[PDB]
Design an enzyme around this catalytic site. Structure first.
Site, PDB file in Angstrom:
ATOM      1  N   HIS A   1       1.686   4.357  -2.985  1.00 32.14           N
ATOM      2  CA  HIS A   1       1.522   5.813  -2.919  1.00 32.14           C
ATOM      3  C   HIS A   1       2.620   6.520  -3.769  1.00 32.14           C
ATOM      4  CE1 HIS A   1      -1.759   6.570  -0.095  1.00 32.14           C
ATOM      5  NE2 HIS A   1      -1.203   5.936   0.907  1.00 32.14           N
TER       6      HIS A   1
ATOM      7  N   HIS B   1       0.853  -1.203   0.000  1.00 29.77           N
ATOM      8  CA  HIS B   1       0.000   0.000   0.000  1.00 29.77           C
ATOM      9  C   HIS B   1       0.893   1.260   0.000  1.00 29.77           C
ATOM     10  CE1 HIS B   1      -3.292   2.680   1.905  1.00 29.77           C
ATOM     11  NE2 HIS B   1      -2.104   3.350   2.290  1.00 29.77           N
ATOM     12  N   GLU B   2       1.955   1.196   0.845  1.00 29.07           N
ATOM     13  CA  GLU B   2       2.837   2.362   0.899  1.00 29.07           C
ATOM     14  C   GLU B   2       3.571   2.608  -0.437  1.00 29.07           C
ATOM     15  OE1 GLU B   2       1.915   4.136   3.283  1.00 29.07           O
ATOM     16  OE2 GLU B   2       1.525   2.690   4.892  1.00 29.07           O
TER      17      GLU B   2
ATOM     18  N   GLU C   1      -0.899  -8.819  -2.434  1.00 28.11           N
ATOM     19  CA  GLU C   1      -0.988  -9.928  -1.532  1.00 28.11           C
ATOM     20  C   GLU C   1      -1.508 -11.188  -2.273  1.00 28.11           C
ATOM     21  OE1 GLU C   1      -2.752  -8.940   2.385  1.00 28.11           O
ATOM     22  OE2 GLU C   1      -3.955 -10.816   2.372  1.00 28.11           O
TER      23      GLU C   1
ATOM     24  N   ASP D   1      -9.105  13.662   9.336  1.00 30.46           N
ATOM     25  CA  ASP D   1      -8.426  12.720   8.449  1.00 30.46           C
ATOM     26  C   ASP D   1      -8.339  13.252   7.111  1.00 30.46           C
ATOM     27  OD1 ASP D   1      -7.373  10.189   7.633  1.00 30.46           O
ATOM     28  OD2 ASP D   1      -9.347   9.478   7.175  1.00 30.46           O
TER      29      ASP D   1
ATOM     30  N   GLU E   1      -4.465  -7.124   8.224  1.00 27.32           N
ATOM     31  CA  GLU E   1      -4.722  -8.185   9.147  1.00 27.32           C
ATOM     32  C   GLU E   1      -3.562  -8.843   9.772  1.00 27.32           C
ATOM     33  OE1 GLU E   1      -5.410  -8.255   5.905  1.00 27.32           O
ATOM     34  OE2 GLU E   1      -4.023  -9.913   5.285  1.00 27.32           O
TER      35      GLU E   1
ATOM     36  N   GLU F   1      -5.987   6.899  -1.422  1.00 28.26           N
ATOM     37  CA  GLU F   1      -5.943   5.782  -0.420  1.00 28.26           C
ATOM     38  C   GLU F   1      -6.523   4.417  -0.946  1.00 28.26           C
ATOM     39  OE1 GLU F   1      -4.952   5.031   2.759  1.00 28.26           O
ATOM     40  OE2 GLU F   1      -3.500   6.523   2.009  1.00 28.26           O
TER      41      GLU F   1
ATOM     42  N   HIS G   1      -9.083   8.236   4.776  1.00 24.99           N
ATOM     43  CA  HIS G   1      -9.050   6.868   5.168  1.00 24.99           C
ATOM     44  C   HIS G   1     -10.518   6.328   5.382  1.00 24.99           C
ATOM     45  CE1 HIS G   1      -4.980   8.023   6.078  1.00 24.99           C
ATOM     46  NE2 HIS G   1      -4.633   6.811   5.620  1.00 24.99           N
TER      47      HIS G   1
ATOM     48  N   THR H   1      -3.583  -5.745  16.001  1.00 23.85           N
ATOM     49  CA  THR H   1      -4.088  -6.475  17.197  1.00 23.85           C
ATOM     50  C   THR H   1      -3.857  -7.911  17.284  1.00 23.85           C
ATOM     51  OG1 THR H   1      -6.208  -6.941  16.135  1.00 23.85           O
ATOM     52  CG2 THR H   1      -5.930  -4.894  17.352  1.00 23.85           C
TER      53      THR H   1
ATOM     54  N   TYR I   1      -3.700  14.796  -1.463  1.00 22.92           N
ATOM     55  CA  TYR I   1      -4.084  14.045  -0.313  1.00 22.92           C
ATOM     56  C   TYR I   1      -5.179  14.655   0.541  1.00 22.92           C
ATOM     57  CZ  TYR I   1      -3.234   9.938   2.750  1.00 22.92           C
ATOM     58  OH  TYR I   1      -3.277   8.713   3.426  1.00 22.92           O
TER      59      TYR I   1
ATOM     60  N   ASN J   1      -1.632 -16.165   1.862  1.00 21.77           N
ATOM     61  CA  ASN J   1      -3.014 -16.175   2.458  1.00 21.77           C
ATOM     62  C   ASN J   1      -3.772 -14.901   2.114  1.00 21.77           C
ATOM     63  OD1 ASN J   1      -2.901 -18.202   4.623  1.00 21.77           O
ATOM     64  ND2 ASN J   1      -1.573 -16.671   5.529  1.00 21.77           N
TER      65      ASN J   1
END
Ligand SMILES: [Ca+2]
Ligand SMILES: [Ca+2]
Ligand SMILES: [Ca+2]
Ligand SMILES: [Ca+2]
Ligand SMILES: [Zn+2]
Length: 316
Positions: free
Chosen positions: A146, A142-143, A177, A226, A190, A166, A231, A194, A157, A183
């Site tokens: 940009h 993702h980065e 991915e 934001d 993900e 974004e 986002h 957390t 932005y 996966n």
């Protein structure tokens, strides 16, 4: 640095072993000479000055825990470079093989990652909300996208143009991915978010509302945080993109899916040939339609699915 190219081995944030391309000159450095003008990873040593020290190691083996984030930022940046080259024929983010640089261990407990206009930067997380951010290939990709946007459409932005910027980054990070087949899913972040809870993620492209982001134009955020919700409102485009690829019925509108490859070809064309720095959602739709038209013909189903998907999120 000038030296001999070689390959070293290490373990990533998630604990997986991988080989990475290094350069040897007294020390072994995280410098991959096999791709364009090079991929280079730096140690920011918990500080905020950048880029930091080019990563040096004594023995070409990277199994220390402090090494983890550097190994995955270096490896995932190669994977992403490969995706762009193989799949879109684009050489690095500027199309001319510009060196790719990243720094890890940026600051202390920093829960974020970003492209600063010249390089990538990754925090190690506080350990609860995130673990080191370069452990997620969708985050890395993702980065890096940009940078690709900055050298092409140049989407400012903020507001709608910023939410498109974004969405672009989430769409290509997810395509990457899937390309690496690590996966894959349609969720964002993900693997590094957390560590205590399973099953969640930062954002969902398949159902943005799950985490509270809008999945229809009528629900867009119109305030100021934001940056005008870059986002938040990216969720409307993200949903459109998931529908183009996968299909489904959303708000009563049915979309037949045309698959990932085609989704990626249409979006890359829109990005590189039709979007501009101040494009808004409605212009994005014209662009995407023109792209599919260019590529598959005006009476194609491809075109038809792109129209349905935007009609389903309320973008006219
Ligand atoms: Ca070592
Ligand atoms: Ca995944
Ligand atoms: Ca993901
Ligand atoms: Ca989690
Ligand atoms: Zn972003």
């Amino acid at each position: 640095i000038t030296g001999t190219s070689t390959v070293g081995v290490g373990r990533g944030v998630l604990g997986d072993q991988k080989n990475i391309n290094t350069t040897y000159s007294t020390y072994y450095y995280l410098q991959d000479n096999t791709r364009g003008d090079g991929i280079f990873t730096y140690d920011a040593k918990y500080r905020t000055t950048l880029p930091g020290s080019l990563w040096a190691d004594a023995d070409n083996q990277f199994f220390a825990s402090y090494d983890a984030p550097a190994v995955d930022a270096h490896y995932y940046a190669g994977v992403t470079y490969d995706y762009y080259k193989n799949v879109h024929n684009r050489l690095s983010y500027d199309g001319n093989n510009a060196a790719i640089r990243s720094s890890v261990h940026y600051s202390q407990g920093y829960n974020n990652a970003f492209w600063n206009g010249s390089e990538m930067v990754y925090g190690d997380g506080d350990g609860q909300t995130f673990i080191p951010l370069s452990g997620g290939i969708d985050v890395v990709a993702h980065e890096l996208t940009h940078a690709v946007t900055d050298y092409t459409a140049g989407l400012i932005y903020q507001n709608e143009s910023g939410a498109i910027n974004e969405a672009i980054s989430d769409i290509f990070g997810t395509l990457v991915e899937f390309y690496a087949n690590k996966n894959p899913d349609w969720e964002i972040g993900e693997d590094v978010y957390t560590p205590g809870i399973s099953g969640d993620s930062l954002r969902s492209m398949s159902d943005p509302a799950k985490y509270g982001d809008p999945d229809h134009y009528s629900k867009r955020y119109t305030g100021t945080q934001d940056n005008g919700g870059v986002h938040i409102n990216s969720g409307i485009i993200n949903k459109a993109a998931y529908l183009i690829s996968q299909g489904g019925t959303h708000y009563g509108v049915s979309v037949v899916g045309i698959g990932r490859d085609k989704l990626g070809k249409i979006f890359y064309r829109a990005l590189t040939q039709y979007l501009t720095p101040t494009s808004n959602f409605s212009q994005l739709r014209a662009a995407a339609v023109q792209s599919a038209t260019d590529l598959y013909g005006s009476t194609s189903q491809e075109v038809a699915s792109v129209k349905q998907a935007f009609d389903a999120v309320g973008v006219k």
